[PDB]
Amino acid sequence: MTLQQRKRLEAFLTQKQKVGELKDDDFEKISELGAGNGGVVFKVSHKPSGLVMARKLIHLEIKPAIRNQIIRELQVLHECNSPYIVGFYGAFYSDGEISICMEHMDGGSLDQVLKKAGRIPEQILGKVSIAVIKGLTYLREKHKIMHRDVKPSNILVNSRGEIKLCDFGVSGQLIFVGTRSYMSPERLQGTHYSVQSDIWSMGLSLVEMAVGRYPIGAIFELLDYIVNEPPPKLPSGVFSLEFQDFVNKCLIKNPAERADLKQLMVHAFIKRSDAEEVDFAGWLCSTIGLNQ
């Protein structure tokens, strides 16, 4: 950690304390940040602190004993404190819906950023990759947590140039209803799986952000393709050989021959990217623009 990262984390944990138990009454809606797989996210104001938060509403049908164990397992999120993880405020049940309250990220997700930028430059994706790896490393080492839901909508960014992971499961399992999938071939097979599965998800997400589009290229037809056909790749000529090799190594279908976190962190793409002074914050703020 840099001193500034060390300090930014300090700064967050103090006003987190300036927050008591959370209740539906204490929240005031500002705007809607989006929705997804059965979750609605709202930009909220928490009046007792006056703090801006993001509040996710999860309609989990049926309580009672099952809902109170969910909230108690969610309490580990208080201990997840990293410059590569989104800050947690608290969680409760209300009106048949679990609410997870977290740090508000003003740049939104890289899914939203991509939709704006068209495609995200390779040098920026180096900064994103370093952050994702470090966040996945942190979750593994400090909490023995695997993410299980790496994708562009779960990598959040802000006007301070921070890149953070969110929506990592903490309740066990509890682990295709949509049109796209970031699940590895081995996860689709029902096979046992590990953090190698998150590496595939990261690799796929990177190719989506580099080219501007989900790269595979009906839901069950798509899943069959992931399982049975060659992995996606970057186009040649427009991306560095080492970036191509980096995603290729993330996208090897055998999770055991696929690169691991340790290997990727010393990979030539990561080595090069880490030494590059790239103004990511300026890129992001110039790309999204300012509220006017």
Ligand SMILES: CC1(C)CNC(=O)c2sc(Nc3ccc(I)cc3F)c(C(=O)N[C@@H]3CCCNC3)c2C1
């Ligand atoms: C059901 C759940 C509350 C179990 N507890 C769980 O363990 C979680 S945790 C968690 N998200 C989460 C994780 C970390 C941070 I920082 C912020 C977060 F919002 C989530 C979460 O949102 N899951 C969504 C439910 C809708 C469909 N997609 C998966 C969960 C799931």
Ligand SMILES: Nc1ncnc2c1ncn2[C@@H]1O[C@H](COP(=O)(O)OP(=O)(O)NP(=O)(O)O)[C@@H](O)[C@H]1O
């Ligand atoms: N802390 C946050 N700050 C800003 N935006 C957020 C935050 N959390 C979630 N969002 C946005 O809310 C939208 C919907 O989030 P979500 O319900 O997590 O959908 P999803 O990420 O596509 N699916 P999943 O993460 O699997 O539940 C996304 O576009 C996010 O960018």
Ligand SMILES: [Mg+2]
């Ligand atoms: Mg999400």
